[model samples]
Target: DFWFCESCQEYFVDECPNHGPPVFVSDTPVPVGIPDRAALTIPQGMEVVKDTSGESDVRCVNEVIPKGHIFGPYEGQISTQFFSWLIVDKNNRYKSIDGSDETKANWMRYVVISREEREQNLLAFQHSERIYFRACRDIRPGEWLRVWYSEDYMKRLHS
Candidate 1:
């Protein structure tokens, strides 16, 4: 279970860091929105930046992470506040964490591995240089943003 500390505005698994007596009751108003970067740490060797390329129909980000590098253990809400797209497994049929309906799947962030498809699009970019972004690109090795896609998933989008 996730617990929130109002005084510091952070989330914790077990206890709060501020004043003792560990106030469990909610006498004070609960703050809104997700925690900031101080509370959320980017995985080792990753950076988050906006996709300023201004391409329409932009669905994801285009920042590349080296192969075999582990990034994220990210956290965020799915509907509007998310740090990254959920890479749906083919075995899982492209659905995220026990997705109930195609449209209303509940989402959460997690540590992700930097894996890429075998083939590359020669016309678009070099294999090593190639990375997914929100638009221009959306997904990065480490960042908080939106959209979810895979080669099969992209095909599904077109089909």
Candidate 2:
């Protein structure tokens, strides 16, 4: 069973002065293993500066512990207010925007370290970046956010 927060149990989507709303998993409580610090700092008013070199990142800003950057919404079955969480990659296998779909490509955020395909295929490690973002609670600007991560066999069967 998942432990959904008060805000998450219901749906709330809105974009305010500095950031966008948060998304959440079905009634599930966030795992206890995530870190307590922010990976990147998001300043107020995330400007849409262009990137010709394609290295610069455009994201929303927040002011909380383990702060989250605002991202687009989801396009899958998650029915999320957020379009999709973007965890940028180092390789060019994907485009900066909507370049690939993990469900169709047999690709995911986590690496299958002990799986047969992972052991046999040299390209399996291509996704070694180990990057991803999941909904913490039904999020709001100025709030902390977290995403779920896993590599379990049974749970990942459809993933």
Candidate 3:
């Protein structure tokens, strides 16, 4: 899951900056379908746990988002942290893609990055900074979203 450093006011994949204390926001449950902005209803403690081996039935939602729907930012800003969610623009600056309007629902923007054991899962996209989740073709239910991470990241993470 993702965490933020209250001290630095920036978001990090895991720990706080310099391994300091981190303010726990909410468990990031990924991959919600388009235009349905109903807050995902997952059981507590089951959001982003480390059990890729399938010890727990860790199901992910795979409904298709249309070609141009904008899910929102991968994370929320400090001011909207407890209030709403958001994402970034081309410059890697914070932008709001709030879910208050049902018509604004879309896939949460995510880019391909790395983890050691699952290196084969990510796909390369043109943009280096952030990759907005886009549906080139129709995605069906039960198909988990996938993309690529930096090859070096994959090697290092999996090495």
Candidate 4:
């Protein structure tokens, strides 16, 4: 994937510059509720929408997302402290991914979380210290991207 650093006026191979994540360069521009910071493309057919609370969230705008469709890894600030919206690995390892700065972080940060187990569709897990999400169940077009690592305590690495 090719990435662009609008500020630097440069191109990268899905790579980023010093600190800021690069903007994805695409042939077709998609609409979004909030800018997606870590994608070369926000997956074909998925969409982001803003809610009444001024919060934005993601959804599958297409017919379906296969059970194992792996979304890209999320990017954010890995810091020494955190709270709210921060990826707290209640268990350990990824103890940090504080995406407080929306600009430098990934668009996945805008995904809405559902606390109820039955409502969850997307899942979060750690691989190589990065968080990746995938459809645990086949997702329908209109279904919003919802999930909770509530048990986010132990969903670590997988084969």
Candidate 5:
């Protein structure tokens, strides 16, 4: 189960590092998998910075975002249509994970989309049918964040 360490203002795995007993934050345990980077906070030494045309990126400051790192069960409200951040479920191809409200979603919401193959460093994918991100390659410091909304069998929504 997930928990909150009030003193540290962060979630705890088993116990609080500060020695204060953590409060089991209410939520069902054993979700689809490890939760998204959904704590509403960016990873260490990274910052979400503004770009042109409402674009944004998670930037590396000091260290690198290593390859093979897993990111999320992306958080977003249930909605659809329009533009960016709109993704449908893998199993229930009819559903959507709308990211229009930044306040309700995680940092992944701000991660800009990539263009051709050469520009992408992260892979946007799903596990057990939920959305997630994985570093496709090690992102050196100063490399901006970007993702490839991978074209998988899910995208092959063929009749």
Candidate 6:
């Protein structure tokens, strides 16, 4: 249900930055929760394609990254694209979703941001960034998917 580039159109995995299991491998059986279908709604003049982050994490880019860090406004699939996944650490509260270790189970969940007809969201600067998430078996209220703050990660990358 996710969109892939012509280079590897047949593949659909977490193509964010570095390190992560593919969202889906060809040999792996498609899971039950792997959304029904994927869709995009970028307005004219805007594009929706994978960004050239690297072979490891095919992060999509609508506009060029600034002098240093990276943000959202992804011009690609809403969920499966690299922007969707986030890492967990001490800083973010809910250390695990709802602060439960069992629920944490590595503390990750596949999440997505609402899309629009135009690639840019309400805020141009902020919109031009990605949302981080993971896939979970189940969840309950008060549970917060503790994803890494991407900008912070990029800072670490710069250092």
lDDT tens digits, residue span 18-116, model 1: 633222111112232433321223332333332478221211134543222212222233232123343333343332222223122212122122334
lDDT for each residue of candidate 4 in 10-60, tens digit (9 for 90 to 100): 545654455354322121233333455433235667776766897776777
The candidate, 1 or 3, that scores higher on TM-score is 3
lDDT of each: 0.28, 0.26, 0.33, 0.57, 0.57, 0.25
Report the C-alpha displacement of residue 124, candidate 5, in angstroms. Answer: 0.6
- CA deviation > 4 Å runs, candidate 6: 1-38, 49-84, 87-91, 94-151, 155-159
- TM-score of candidate 2 versus the correct structure, residues matched by position: 0.22
Give the per-residue lDDT digits (tens) of candidate 5, residues 19-131: 44422112122232234433334656667776588656677679876665556656667653422444445444545676555555666677767776786887676555456
Please, what are the lDDT tens digits per residue for candidate 2 over residues 23-93? 32221122322331111122243322335873222332452322232222222222112123233244323
Models 1 onward score TM values of 0.24, 0.22, 0.27, 0.62, 0.62, 0.19
Better of 1 and 6 by lDDT: 1
Tell me the TM-score of model 6. Answer: 0.19
| Backbone clashes in model 5, listed as residue pairs | none
RMSD of every prediction: 16.6, 16.5, 16.0, 11.8, 11.6, 19.1
Stretches > 4 Å off in candidate 5: 1-40, 51-55, 79-92, 153-159
State the local distance difference test value for candidate 5.
0.57
Ranking by lDDT: 5, 4, 3, 1, 2, 6
Poorest lDDT segment (10 consecutive residues) of candidate 1: 120-129
What tens-digit string does per-residue lDDT give for candidate 3 at 1-159?
243332354546655556454322233353544343323423232222225773212223444433322222333222323123233345545544343333333223222222443322323222233223323233344434444343332332332
